[model samples]
Target: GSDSFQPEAKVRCICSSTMVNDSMIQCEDQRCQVWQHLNCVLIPDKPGESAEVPPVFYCELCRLSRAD
Candidate 1:
């Protein structure tokens, strides 16, 4: 029931636009921006580690860029 099969196209996750991080972490490295989301980013593993830890995310483009 579709017209195209563009797998490389960047699209939203199953979670929909309800999440802020859903489309906040796309990439344009090599291919089109990818589909990768971060529920809980680079936060401190220990609650007492820090009052607030910076979050982090890596798209497939970054990983692909590192590839040969």
Candidate 2:
């Protein structure tokens, strides 16, 4: 059933530090550095999901998640 009521989702860069230029940004941490399209990030899991949403990248020093 496709309900019109869909949960809201948001994405954020997982870096120790992030620089935003308009809608673009570069993220970096001790593990690695990567570029992300602000809109390309995925939303966190909702009430219906059982598993944790995997991060697009892994940061050994820091991990990023959507801000509340």
Candidate 3:
């Protein structure tokens, strides 16, 4: 039941769409710009608390080549 709703949320997950809806993270591809929640993203759920803020977020999948 609830599982069927994530696609709905994914549809709702477009970046830069809102400033007040805090449940989602806004992102840009590296070019617009992760479980590590959404790809190429950032969130202000804690606003000013640095401890809660990420100093440097790393995305491992973004760094590898085909190696072919």
Candidate 4:
């Protein structure tokens, strides 16, 4: 009966974020420690592999710094 509007502050990240309603991914790197929406971060498609999170995640800044 009292579960209608449970308003709260937005959960934001360095790259702009969303609520629990959507999927999320957090970076493990300290350089760019932040959370990212799964959809916001596009995973490179691979043959015979489904889109999924990596064991170790790094945000855009960390990724760029690493320079693969």
* Regions of candidate 4 where Cα sits further than 4 Å from its true position: 1-15, 44-49
Model 3 CA lDDT for position 1: 25
TM-score, candidate number 1: 0.32
lDDT-best of 1 and 3: 1
Rank candidates by TM-score, best first. Answer: 4, 1, 2, 3
lDDT of each: 0.45, 0.38, 0.34, 0.57
**Across residues 1-68, which tens digit of lDDT does each residue of candidate 3 receive?**
23333422322233533233533332222421222333324544565533243544333333333221
User: Model 2, range 37-64, lDDT digits (tens) per residue?
Assistant: 4433434366444434344443323454
Best by lDDT: 4
Candidate 4 structure quality by residue, lDDT tens digits, 1-68: 23322233222445543555357766776444466676556564875456666777666677888885
Estimate candidate 3's RMSD in Å.
9.5
My TM-score estimates for the predictions, one after another, are: 0.32, 0.26, 0.18, 0.54
Question: Candidate 4: TM-score?
Answer: 0.54
CA lDDT for candidate 2: 0.38
lDDT of 2 at 26: 34
Off by over 4 Å in 3: 1-35, 38-53, 63-68
Error of 1 at 43 (Å): 5.7
Give the clashing pairs for model 4. none
Query: For model 2, how many clashes?
Result: 0
TM-score-superior candidate, 2 or 4: 4
